[PDB]
Each structure stands twice: as structure tokens, then as C-alpha cells.
Amino acid sequence: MQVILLDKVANLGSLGDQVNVKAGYARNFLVPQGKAVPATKKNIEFFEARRAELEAKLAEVLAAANARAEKINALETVTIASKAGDEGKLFGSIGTRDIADAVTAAGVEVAKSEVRLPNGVLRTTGEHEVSFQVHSEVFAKVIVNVVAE
Amino acid sequence: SRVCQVTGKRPVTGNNRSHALNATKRRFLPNLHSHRFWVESEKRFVTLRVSAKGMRVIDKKGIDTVLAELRARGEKY
Amino acid sequence: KLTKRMRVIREKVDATKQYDINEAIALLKELATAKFVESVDVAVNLGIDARKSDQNVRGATVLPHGTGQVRYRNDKNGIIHTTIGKVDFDADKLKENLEALLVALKKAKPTQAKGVYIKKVSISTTMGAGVAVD
Amino acid sequence: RKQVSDGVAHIHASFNNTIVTITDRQGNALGWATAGGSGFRGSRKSTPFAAQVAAERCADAVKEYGIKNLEVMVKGPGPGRESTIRALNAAGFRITNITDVTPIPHNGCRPPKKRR
RNA sequence: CCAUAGGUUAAUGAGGCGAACCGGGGGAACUGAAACAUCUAAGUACCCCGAGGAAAAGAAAUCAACCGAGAUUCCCCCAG
RNA sequence: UUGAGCCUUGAUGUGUAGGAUAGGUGGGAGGCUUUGAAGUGUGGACGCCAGUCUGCAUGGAGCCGACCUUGAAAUACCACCCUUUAAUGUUUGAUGUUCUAACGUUGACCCGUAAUCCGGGUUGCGGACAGUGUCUGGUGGGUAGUUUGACUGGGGCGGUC
RNA sequence: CGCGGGGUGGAGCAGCCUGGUAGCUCGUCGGGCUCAUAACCCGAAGGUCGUCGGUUCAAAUCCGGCCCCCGCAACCA
């Protein structure tokens, strides 16, 4: 299925070629995520005149406007108090909106769609570093402790 | 009922012709599936009970152009 | 495995570029740059084989040019190999000379051929690589 | 081939038969030879000589690995033991260390009643 | 958040009955074959939906035989 | 991960006679080299371990044609490709692992709402499986339609046609 | 109506693929053994491979036919 692109992609396409993907890849993922638009002829001529440089490069500059809000977390080191047992043994480990809204009051306006955890749901006690892909290109890196309440 | 909301396929009938040509009645059911479709204009998901051929029509015509004529036939997606 | 003679030859003859009618006749002259005059090596890739000997073709070339009326032999895996003259003969001389074998092979038809006789020819200047004329 | 240098020779010297398995250090087997495979079906495999030819027939089954250092692990009651090690020493292997790994229980499983 | 879903009110229309005919969706079996299964009975009986005074079809991507004919419907022949 | 096809540098198969890890015939009987040789050292690879090969490079401008005995001609140049290898690209396939965005949810929560249905929304877990459609093999007295001969000293059994 | 497979001393099994260099298990005989039988070790006698054609420097194996036994799936005078 021939389709033209709107963001770059995590793969083969680079904003302006019309790659031929399988029909499930376009219909279920690319078009509702706004990373593509189907390549009928009325959209191909919509691409070269309207799309190709006007606000297609609104996206990359707004990515670069987020590539410093990438590092508007100048502290990257937030501890969260939740009651535990003696010697570790947490009652309930913090999740990912439990860490997104933790950094909301202490830095960046981030929801849990943008938080990526390497190892589970951070069950234990100690300074562990949770990754942050608010951005599509490069992650951000935030150290987090959890102590007993 | 088992009708595609786009094309309007219906469960037609036929025969089960055996090897010795014994005709027994049967039914052909039209491959229906419920599928959420992302309409870009309305900025939402519309769930339609379509056949598999109906998805190709929505992948050939516009979704909203297809959904324009479901409005014209008095369908209520 | 390959040295400075066919180093110049094998990228000047393109064996995987299967040439057309009036293409391959002159582009193989640069592959005979030795102290001695080199001749032709013709390999009409046929539809014959020695499954049994009813698919055998012998014969001759009734050729006024020659090396000469040249005869030929059969192979078992189904390759012909002839020699019809020299390559220091002029350029378009090879065009009528290659297809004079095929008018000699069209009348040389094998009787147990369940298929077309030839598919496509490749020739060589006896020391280089294959030149795929039609 | 992998061509490993140091290896382990296991010897299963049971009462009826002896099995000589040459492995690497980790335990992965490389080749083996028993007394029954060398002929000697019956009473002849229960002798020390059939153990000797079983070790020799196992030495040239690992010629493609070029083992030079062998540590021997003998296990069992059989007459194989003190003759199948000498066959490895004559075979051109350097005996790094010998140990017996004979499994002796710390008293529990009922053994059979057998043989009146 | 917007917006939709929903709610309320008003306007307009439908609903139900009826004999046959008509279009469509489903659709038998006894019977005939001197048994019977393919096949017949028959797309009949029946069920269901829909409409009109008629309904259906209907202006050739039709036929014809190189000569031509010119939408559909119905009757008589072709022809058992 | 990985076959299987495919592009191509590159690669393969000594019975014996008797120098000859050479597939069949030859074309043609010389390629070759100082845009720096025969003989060698070895990392290996291969192996009926018989024997050939190549790379940092030593050596470093000469090696060598049918001659030798051969049933045969010498990757000294050779064509097309045979058994098997080669790496580069392609083609899908095969599994395997992971993902989530289809799809599932007879998990939790919110709203429609005074509602154990339903729908929508968050969220969790599954996840391209499951499931359904078409096609297809197997199974299928669960069900259905039917068949199951005639003569015959009554019919059956026996025999016969 | 078609896919491949098995047929090897009296009796049963390998080596088929990668061609030459027909081996075993028992039963028969001959030795050794034992107080005797059994067992056991050595050696031997019995088939040129169901049959018919091919090629090569050499085939019992490979190439097709032809026969019997299959194991199946197929099969509407």
C-alpha cells in the first residue's frame, strides 16, 4: 500500500518518499499516529506544494523546541517517599504516573506515555535511573530514589 | 444482523454439493469483523462492523467519503 | 586466481550483460592483446543433453570464411563448441559468422528434442571470458 | 572443530562394562568408547584389558581436538579403573590430576535384595 | 478543556386492516423414475417483507451474419 | 537464527599406469613479467591425512608449452558449467525472541444513570496468538434420506439363476 | 489408474545415498573346552543378490523396464 509520510519514522521512511508498507501497518498504526497519509493522487500533489517544506519543518523545530525541554530537567534527581518495610520491602511500588506526576511538581510536565522504565515497575529501594523519552529521537535520563515514608 | 455496514453483504444461501451431488442447503456468511476506524476529520474512532472486502473499500475510497454515504443510506454508525 | 591479463579483460567483457544482436560483435576485440593472434570460442548454450544418445547432434559448418569448413563435436552436458575463424579478422565479419552456425544448426535438428534447440549464446576469445550475443 | 587444549576424561568403570567419555572442562562430551564397542561382548568386557583398548579407542576419537592436558574422573567398582588410566598415559596425554567421583550415598535408598 | 454521547421541547411523517394480482427474502415433501441417492415434483405449497392500481422490467457494453435489425412487455408461430 | 532459490569474485571429484586433490572435450600448443620473479617461513583451511591452495611478508624482474611414462589433457590463459563449497546482494520461507497499534478481556475504575445490560472513557493483562469468514483433509448413527433380489410343493435355512 | 519403499547362503539383518575393497546373526559340520550336558572362543561349508536391457578402464550397488509383496492416498461404462 503506497503511502506518503509526515514524521520521519523509526524506520525506512524519511518524510517525502512514498514507501509501500503492508496494509495493516498503514491502517492501524501510521495514519492514526499521524505519521502518514494515504497516497491517492490528490494527496501527492498536496505534498509537494503544501506539505513539503511549509509546516513539515514546523515539526522538527518543535522537536528542537522540545530538545531543550529534553533537558529542562536540570536536577534529574528526585526521591519519592512511599512506606515500605524494614530493609527494603516496599508496600506498593511507585508506577509511572506515580513517577510522572512526581517530576511534574519537581520539573517537567510529563505524563506516563513519555516515561520508559528499564526493569519492571521499580519495586525496591535505591537510586535507580529511569529513562525518559518525551522526544522521538534521543532519550533523557533521570536518577530516582525511593525511601520509606 | 450479519450485514456489512459499508458494502451491505448479506448471508446468501446455497447448496452443499457432495461428491455424489446430494444437494443440501447451506449459508455463506460474509466475513464480518468489528473494526475501529480512525476518522481524521472527527478526531475520534468510529467502530464499524465491516466485511474484509469493506476494509479494502475504506482503504481505496476515503473513510469519510465512505462514511458520507452511510449517512446517505440512513445507517447509524 | 586471476592476474593482469584477465584483470583488464573480465571487467571489459560483461558476461552478465547478455547483449543484443548488433552489440556483442565488436566489444570483444580488446581481449586478445597477446603476442599471438587469438581465435573464437563459441558456446551456443543448447537444449541438448546425454540422458540418452537420441539427443545427439553432430555435423559441420559449410562456411566460406573458416579458420575452411569446420566440423564440431558433441558434449554430454549439452554445450557446443566450435571455431569459425580469427578475431583479427574485421569487426562485422563475426556477425554473419556467428549466425552461419545457427543456420547450420537449424537444419541439424535433434529428433528427441522436447523443447527449443538454443536458448542464448555466449562466445569468448579463447583466453578471456564469455561474450553473450543472441 | 573447536580445537580445545585441556579436557576431562570420565571413566564409568561398572562391574559389567566400562565407558570412557572425554569431555571439555565445562562437561560437553567430545567422544567416547566402551568395552562393548571394542568387541568383547560378554565376559570379555568385564576384564581390565577391554578397558585398556576402550581408552585407546577413545583417544583416537578425539584426535581432531588436539587435547594435551587430561584430568581423570574415575567412577565405579569395576576392574576398569587402574588399567584404563594407564592406557591414557601411554596414549600421549598429560595427566593433570586424578580424582574418584564414585557416588556414595549418605545412607538412603534401599539397595536391591539380589542374588541368592 | 473543547467536542461528542445523552436529555428536554416543538414540527412533520409512519404504525393497523384488506380478496386476488405483482416484486423480493427464504423454501419443502409426498409423488415420477414402475425400487432409489443424481434428477423430477418445483423455485410449486408455505412462511416473511415491500408496493401499486397495476407491479415489474425498459432505451442496448442487445441481436444478427457480414445483408441487416433497432427499448421493455404480451399474444401466435418457430417447435416438442 | 536460518534454509531454499538466485547474482558473482572464488571454489570441485589421486583405480591404475605411474611426477600429477585434473568434470567432459578442446580452442589452441604458450601463457607469463619489472603499474617489482622461481624457490620459501607460517597463520590456517581442507583431508581416502593422499596431498594442493592462498594471505602481513621474507625472498624480491623471472617462472615455464604439449617433452617424461599417460586410457586423458595440464585453474601456464581458457569457454560453458558438472559434485560440493563461497561471500556479497536479492527473493521469500522456516522457526525463535521481543514489541504494540489491530483484535480479545465474562479485570479494576469513571460517566451516560436512580441501572450487575449496554456504550463511551481511562487503566491493567493478554496480543498478532486467540477467535470468526471462505476453501480444505479427517472424524461423524449425533441426525437424515433410503436400499436390503427372485424361484421356492407356505416362508426361512439349504440349493439355484 | 500414481507416489516414493522393501525383495540379499537353510533362515534373518547391514553396508544403497558419497560407485570398485558381499560382511553378520542363528541353525548345520570341524576343533579347543568339561566328570558330562549347556554355554563359550577359533576355523570352515553353503548364496554372485526376483528377472530382462544400459554405459564405463572395473558393478553384486546406479539407469530404466518387467514380476511379486506392499504401505497408503485415489477410482461414476
Curated annotation (Swiss-Prot), chain A:
Positions where N6-succinyllysine occurs in the chain: 71, 83, 112
SUPFAM superfamilies cross-referenced by the UniProt entry: L9 N-domain-like (SSF55658), Ribosomal protein L9 C-domain (SSF55653)
Keyword Ribosomal protein in annotation: yes
PROSITE patterns: RIBOSOMAL_L9 (PS00651)
Keyword Ribosomal protein assigned: yes
GO MF annotations in UniProt: large ribosomal subunit rRNA binding; structural constituent of ribosome
InterPro entries: Ribosomal_bL9, Ribosomal_bL9/RNase_H1_N, Ribosomal_bL9_bac/chp, Ribosomal_bL9_C, Ribosomal_bL9_C_sf, Ribosomal_bL9_N, Ribosomal_bL9_N_sf
Keywords, ordered alphabetically: Acetylation, Ribonucleoprotein, Ribosomal protein, RNA-binding, rRNA-binding
Single GO cellular component term: cytosol
Domain of life of the organism encoding this protein: Bacteria
Family as reported in the entry's similarity comment: Belongs to the bacterial ribosomal protein bL9 family.
Function: One of the primary rRNA binding proteins, it binds very close to the 3' end of the 23S rRNA.
Family matches, as NCBIfam families: L9
Oligomeric and partner information: Part of the 50S ribosomal subunit. In stalled/collided disomes (pairs of ribosomes where the leading ribosome is stalled and a second ribosome has collided with it) bL9 in the collided ribosome contacts bS6 and uL2, while it contacts only helices of the 16S rRNA in the stalled ribosome; the inter-ribosome bridge thus formed is different from that formed between normally translating ribosomes.
Matching HAMAP family: Ribosomal_bL9 (MF_00503)
Name listed for the protein in its UniProt record: Large ribosomal subunit protein bL9
Organism from which the protein derives: Escherichia coli (strain K12)
Taxon lineage: Bacteria, Pseudomonadati, Pseudomonadota, Gammaproteobacteria, Enterobacterales
UniProtKB/Swiss-Prot annotation, chain B:
Top-level taxon of origin: Bacteria
PANTHER family given in the database record: 39S RIBOSOMAL PROTEIN L28, MITOCHONDRIAL, LARGE RIBOSOMAL SUBUNIT PROTEIN BL28M
Family: Belongs to the bacterial ribosomal protein bL28 family.
Oligomer status and interactors: Part of the 50S ribosomal subunit.
A biological process from GO: cytoplasmic translation
Gene3D superfamilies: Ribosomal protein L28/L24
Name assigned to this protein: Large ribosomal subunit protein bL28
Cellular component aspect of the GO annotation: cytoplasm; cytosol; cytosolic large ribosomal subunit
InterPro entries the UniProt entry points to: Ribosomal_bL28, Ribosomal_bL28/bL31-like_sf, Ribosomal_bL28_bact-type, Ribosomal_bL28_sf
Keywords per UniProt: Ribonucleoprotein, Ribosomal protein, RNA-binding, rRNA-binding
GO molecular function, one term: structural constituent of ribosome
From Swiss-Prot, chain C:
UniProt source species: Escherichia coli (strain K12)
GO cellular component: cytoplasm; cytosol; cytosolic large ribosomal subunit
Molecular function per GO: rRNA binding; structural constituent of ribosome; tRNA binding
Sites bearing N6-succinyllysine, chain numbering: 95, 106
Protein name in UniProt: Large ribosomal subunit protein uL1
Top-level division of the source organism's lineage: Bacteria
Family in the record: Belongs to the universal ribosomal protein uL1 family.
Xref: SUPFAM superfamilies: Ribosomal protein L1
Subunit relationships: Part of the 50S ribosomal subunit. Cross-links to the P and E site tRNAs.
Keyword list, A-Z: Repressor, Ribonucleoprotein, Ribosomal protein, RNA-binding, rRNA-binding, Translation regulation, tRNA-binding
NCBIfam families registered for this protein in UniProt: rplA_bact
Role summary: One of the primary rRNA binding proteins, it binds very close to the 3'-end of the 23S rRNA. Forms part of the L1 stalk. It is often not seen in high-resolution crystal structures, but can be seen in cryo_EM and 3D reconstruction models. These indicate that the distal end of the stalk moves by approximately 20 angstroms. This stalk movement is thought to be coupled to movement of deacylated tRNA into and out of the E site, and thus to participate in tRNA translocation. Contacts the P and E site tRNAs. Protein L1 is also a translational repressor protein, it controls the translation of the L11 operon by binding to its mRNA.
Swiss-Prot/TrEMBL GO biological process terms: cytoplasmic translation; negative regulation of translational initiation; ribosomal large subunit assembly
Swiss-Prot record, chain D:
Keywords: Methylation, Ribonucleoprotein, Ribosomal protein, RNA-binding, rRNA-binding
Disulfide partners: none
Span of the signal peptide: none
One Pfam family linked to the record: Ribosomal_S11
Record carries keyword Cell membrane: no
Gene Ontology CC entries for this record: cytoplasm; cytosol; cytosolic small ribosomal subunit
GO MF terms held by the record: small ribosomal subunit rRNA binding; structural constituent of ribosome
One of the GO BP terms on file: cytoplasmic translation
Function text: Located on the platform of the 30S subunit, it bridges several disparate RNA helices of the 16S rRNA. Forms part of the Shine-Dalgarno cleft in the 70S ribosome.
HAMAP family for this protein: Ribosomal_uS11
Family assignment from sequence similarity: Belongs to the universal ribosomal protein uS11 family.
Additional free-text comment from the UniProt record: Has been predicted to contact the N-terminal domain of IF-3 based on footprint studies; exactly how IF-3 interacts with the 30S subunit is controversial.
Subunit (UniProt): Part of the 30S ribosomal subunit. Interacts with proteins uS7 and bS18. Cross-links to IF-3. In stalled ribosomes contacts ribosome rescue factor SmrB.
Protein name according to UniProt: Small ribosomal subunit protein uS11
Organism of this sequence: Escherichia coli (strain K12)
Highest classification ranks of the organism: Bacteria, Pseudomonadati, Pseudomonadota, Gammaproteobacteria, Enterobacterales
Gene symbol of the encoding locus: rpsK
